[PDB]
Design a protein around this ligand. Sequence first.
Ligand SMILES: [Cl-]
Length: 302
Amino acid sequence: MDVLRTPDERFTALPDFPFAPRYVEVDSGDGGTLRMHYLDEGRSDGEVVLLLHGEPSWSYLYRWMIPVLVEAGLRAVAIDLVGFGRSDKPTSRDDYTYQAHVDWMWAAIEEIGLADVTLVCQDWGGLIGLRLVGEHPDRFARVVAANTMLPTGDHHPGEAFLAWQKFSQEVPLFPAGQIVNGGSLSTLSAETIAAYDAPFPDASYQAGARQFPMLVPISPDDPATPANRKAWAALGRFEKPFLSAFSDSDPITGAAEPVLRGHVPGARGQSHVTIAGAGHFLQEDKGRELAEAVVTFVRANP
Ligand SMILES: [Cl-]
């Protein structure tokens, strides 16, 4: 596969993001190697909180949450998906599949060497992350799901998702920063918008961003349907702590909240929260509040 790397000059002086870039290498899947970017902050022996972003964001999305987690004595790790952030970026839309993202993310987790992980996931961070919980439950001590789901293709995704999907394909120029603004209640600053555009100097870097919405299973003939059904079944046996921390103003994922909460046995008896006054990208609107909920949940489940 052919692969681009975003020049480092794109990431100079991003506001509120004083976290050193770290990298791991993973197999591309067709005989080469891809570099993936991650952040690793806080005490080296701290309980790991793994922060996974989705479409079309990157670890920059977690910048308000990281300091709260670190101050609480936790180790915050955030990984950029292939195609995003400071990770390498295959050039063909056909290089990106649900399976490939799952394999790439698992390889990153393994290479970094994370154990007894508290997953915090949103959007595609959870479509990938929750599948990984199903496939490797022993790796995850706890799970926080926020504005996400694990679709098998068996249920209609809702009109809000379909409107996003159509826009993502039809828009002539794909404006990642304005998309994140679109899914936030707060007005993102010009510098924040620029931080989300930083990975994508032009359209040649955006194949992963264009393809993601087409990978969401919305019918049972999806290539991910068999694996997602198996992962869903495994999540239905996950007895370890599971927290629902969805926001109140996200039409795309709102319907998924009670389905996920009801399915996972480890959600029973946990103090689920609704993050008030936040849109889809709830980490932008109420990042501190979500991080505080994660700290409370970790401490309540020693
Ligand atoms: Cl999407």
